[PDB]
Amino acid sequence: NDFHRDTWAEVDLDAIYDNVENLRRLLPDDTHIMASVCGNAYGHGDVQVARTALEAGASRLAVAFLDEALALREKGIEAPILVTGASRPADAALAAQQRIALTVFRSDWLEEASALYSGPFPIHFHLYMDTGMGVKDEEETKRIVALIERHPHFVLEGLWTWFYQYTRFLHMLEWLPSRPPLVFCANSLRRTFNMVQFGIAMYGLAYPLKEAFSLHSRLVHVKKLQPGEKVSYGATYTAQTEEWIGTIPIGYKDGWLRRLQHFHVLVDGQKAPIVGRILMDMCMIRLPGPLPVGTKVTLIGRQGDKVISIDDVARHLETINYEVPCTISYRVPRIFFRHKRIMEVRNAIG
Amino acid sequence: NDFHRDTWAEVDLDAIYDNVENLRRLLPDDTHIMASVCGNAYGHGDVQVARTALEAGASRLAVAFLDEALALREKGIEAPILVTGASRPADAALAAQQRIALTVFRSDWLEEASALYSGPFPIHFHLYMDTGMGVKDEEETKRIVALIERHPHFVLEGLWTWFYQYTRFLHMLEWLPSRPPLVFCANSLRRTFNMVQFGIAMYGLAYPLKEAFSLHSRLVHVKKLQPGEKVSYGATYTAQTEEWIGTIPIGYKDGWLRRLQHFHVLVDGQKAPIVGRILMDMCMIRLPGPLPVGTKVTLIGRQGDKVISIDDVARHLETINYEVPCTISYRVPRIFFRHKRIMEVRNAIG
Numbered sequence: 001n002d003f004h005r006d007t008w009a010e011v012d013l014d015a016i017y018d019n020v021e022n023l024r025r026l027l028p029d030d031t032h033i034m035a036s037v038c039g040n041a042y043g044h045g046d047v048q049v050a051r052t053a054l055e056a057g058a059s060r061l062a063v064a065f066l067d068e069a070l071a072l073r074e075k076g077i078e079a080p081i082l083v084t085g086a087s088r089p090a091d092a093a094l095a096a097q098q099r100i101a102l103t104v105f106r107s108d109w110l111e112e113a114s115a116l117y118s119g120p121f122p123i124h125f126h127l128y129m130d131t132g133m134g135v136k137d138e139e140e141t142k143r144i145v146a147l148i149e150r151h152p153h154f155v156l157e158g159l160w161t162w163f164y165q166y167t168r169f170l171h172m173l174e175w176l177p178s179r180p181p182l183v184f185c186a187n188s189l190r191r192t193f194n195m196v197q198f199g200i201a202m203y204g205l206a207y208p209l210k211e212a213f214s215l216h217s218r219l220v221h222v223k224k225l226q227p228g229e230k231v232s233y234g235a236t237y238t239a240q241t242e243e244w245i246g247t248i249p250i251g252y253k254d255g256w257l258r259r260l261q262h263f264h265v266l267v268d269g270q271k272a273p274i275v276g277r278i279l280m281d282m283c284m285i286r287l288p289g290p291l292p293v294g295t296k297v298t299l300i301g302r303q304g305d306k307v308i309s310i311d312d313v314a315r316h317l318e319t320i321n322y323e324v325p326c327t328i329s330y331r332v333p334r335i336f337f338r339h340k341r342i343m344e345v346r347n348a349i350g
Numbered sequence: 351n352d353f354h355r356d357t358w359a360e361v362d363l364d365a366i367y368d369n370v371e372n373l374r375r376l377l378p379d380d381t382h383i384m385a386s387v388c389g390n391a392y393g394h395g396d397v398q399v400a401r402t403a404l405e406a407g408a409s410r411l412a413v414a415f416l417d418e419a420l421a422l423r424e425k426g427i428e429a430p431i432l433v434t435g436a437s438r439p440a441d442a443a444l445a446a447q448q449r450i451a452l453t454v455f456r457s458d459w460l461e462e463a464s465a466l467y468s469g470p471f472p473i474h475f476h477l478y479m480d481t482g483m484g485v486k487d488e489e490e491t492k493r494i495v496a497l498i499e500r501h502p503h504f505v506l507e508g509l510w511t512w513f514y515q516y517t518r519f520l521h522m523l524e525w526l527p528s529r530p531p532l533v534f535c536a537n538s539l540r541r542t543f544n545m546v547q548f549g550i551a552m553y554g555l556a557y558p559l560k561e562a563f564s565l566h567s568r569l570v571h572v573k574k575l576q577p578g579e580k581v582s583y584g585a586t587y588t589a590q591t592e593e594w595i596g597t598i599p600i601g602y603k604d605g606w607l608r609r610l611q612h613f614h615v616l617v618d619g620q621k622a623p624i625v626g627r628i629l630m631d632m633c634m635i636r637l638p639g640p641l642p643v644g645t646k647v648t649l650i651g652r653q654g655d656k657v658i659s660i661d662d663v664a665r666h667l668e669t670i671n672y673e674v675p676c677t678i679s680y681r682v683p684r685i686f687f688r689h690k691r692i693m694e695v696r697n698a699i700g
Contacts, residue, residue, distance in 0.1 A: 004415065004441050005416065006438070067354045067681070067700075070699075071699045074700055085355070085599055086356070086597075232483045236483075251414075252669075257677075259668075280389060280672055280676070281388065281389075282435065319602075319607075319609070330680045330698075331417070349418065349421045350424055
């Protein structure tokens with residue numbers, strides 16, 4: 001709850017709430033919302049985001065692998081959770097005991113699972129259909145359906161796919177004896193389909209969606225450089241004029257990658273360039289003018305008229321926006337805001 | 351201690367041990383070895399590496415900010431620890447209570463610290479000297495020395511710098527009434543100087559030094575593609591011939607960045623290219639031929655005659671080797687090997 005370096009992320013849970021609420025309003029009353037919270041909720045904080053999305057109308061959670069579902073259960077989350085990635089047949093008992101749903105991709109994964117597991121908890125499976133470009137034919141599907149019907153503790157909960165592929169999907173749906181409780185697709189189509197995946201869009205990333213993630217630091221040293229003065233930590237920055245250099249305590253170990261050398265952060269309402277090499281723990285910006293140590297630096301977020309968004313950082317790095325909050329390391333504290341006030345602080349490094 | 355996805359890192363503590371032992375032999379008996387363990391020991395594991403480096407001859411630890419020193423103390427580490435980065439004057443009482451040494455860069459940081467702290471623990475300070483390109487003149491140094499002598503609980507433990515700069519340093523050393531218990535420089539010069547910084551070289555990264563970090567996965571789906579068959583998850587991979595595609599459960603959320611698309615991993619003793627876009631949680635490789643699911647994929651490490659090193663990954667990414675193990679996310683379990691056998695497993699996600 002306390003932290004001891006002037007570098008932190010802010011997570012606006014009101015933003016999460018609002019994004020989910022707008023969708024919960026728009027969709028029909030009988031279609032479920034699934035909240036994607038893999039990768040520690042894309043660097044925002046798994047349990048804080050899950051709790052908020054659930055309060056706001058989400059009724060189910062999606063994670064990428066079993067450990068992520070286990071961590072949510074451990075932190076007291078009770079809503080249904082789907083593992084959308086690969087899992088070991090041997091971990092079936094664990095998932096069932098923890099009331100975690102598993103995705104199956106291959107009939108012989110299920111053959112192994114069936115041989116290895118006898119009870120006492122039911123396991124819920126979702127079938128991932130290969131819709132074009134997972135399970136791919138009628139024979140494989142029928143096999144799967146037989147395994148589920150023949151095993152006393154197996155249950156076919158859902159069918160899904162990732163997007164002609166649609167008409168393929170319609171066909172594959174007909175291969176089943178009956179329609180499963182839940183049918184949806186993963187990417188977001190945000191038809192029927194009685195569940196939708198609010199993936200990255202819950203975080204404000206691509207009506208109108210609110211962005212949820214800010215990253216900040218403070219100047220920790222300020223220095224006037226004379227024309228010709230050098231700073232060398234690896235590379236060598238040579239001052240062309242009289243200018244001011246500030247240091248901030250964030251580096252590539254924090255996920256503030258060497259490749260953001262150049263990028264323009266916000267100090268005192270002005271864009272300022274990250275200058276010289278990004279080092280493991282500190283980096284230098286050329287300041288808009290002289291400034292006192294302790295001045296806030298905004299790496300992502302709003303300062304005055306200006307705003308830097310995740311999209312901006314993604315462009316400089318040449319990646320998609322997803323990767324940016326995900327790369328911000330666990331050693332960066334997150335301050336969670338809810339109801340315009342401060343709800344909690346997670347410093348993963350006690 | 352258990353983990354539930356087939357993706358893991360291996361950390362060879364024998365490598366750490368050996369690297370430190372070779373240095374402990376080479377250096378004079380009165381010069382200390384300082385072990386750099388910031389950034390969770392560069393992604394290898396803070397407490398496991400500290401413990402090993404200490405067992406092997408290191409007598410002091412270096413971290414980048416206070417929270418890192420606090421986490422080490424909390425996990426039972428008792429050796430002296432220096433914070434080499436910036437700290438808040440107000441946290442002085444906390445560092446003193448926890449017997450953590452602090453680096454000072456500016457005399458008015460110390461003026462604040464002195465005003466705010468009265469006791470009961472002594473605080474050890476190290477002065478970082480600006481040696482050319484921190485504290486910069488005689489007047490500032492004398493001020494600092496006066497503050498330390500006048501305060502009952504302040505102690506000047508060390509002097510250091512990062513590298514004519516040398517002769518500057520010799521001069522600055524003479525500004526002090528006496529020589530501090532410890533004098534060293536940070537970068538590695540690996541003269542006197544009674545302490546050296548075994549930074550990145552402890553990890554086998556640049557006589558002969560052993561590399562300590564491996565990263566591995568397993569194939570989780572295998573698929574034969576016919577000439578012209580496509581896979582689309584974002585980008586579109588179009589098979590030019592008949593070929594085999596394997597999926598592994600690692601993605602950019604694991605620190606396996608989109609930019610490693612192309613890079614060549616090891617499967618079945620062969621180099622194989624990472625193909626199509628790197629997605630959040632999975633990625634595809636074109637296989638040397640048909641292979642059963644469960645086949646080990648080595649992202650960094652040795653398989654048969656072949657070896658992929660951290661340096662190789664750094665080159666493909668266009669960064670320094672430091673950044674690579676540091677970027678591998680906390681959600682990747684680390685398996686620690688000591689005495690050729692398995693010492694423990696850290697799955698940060700219980």
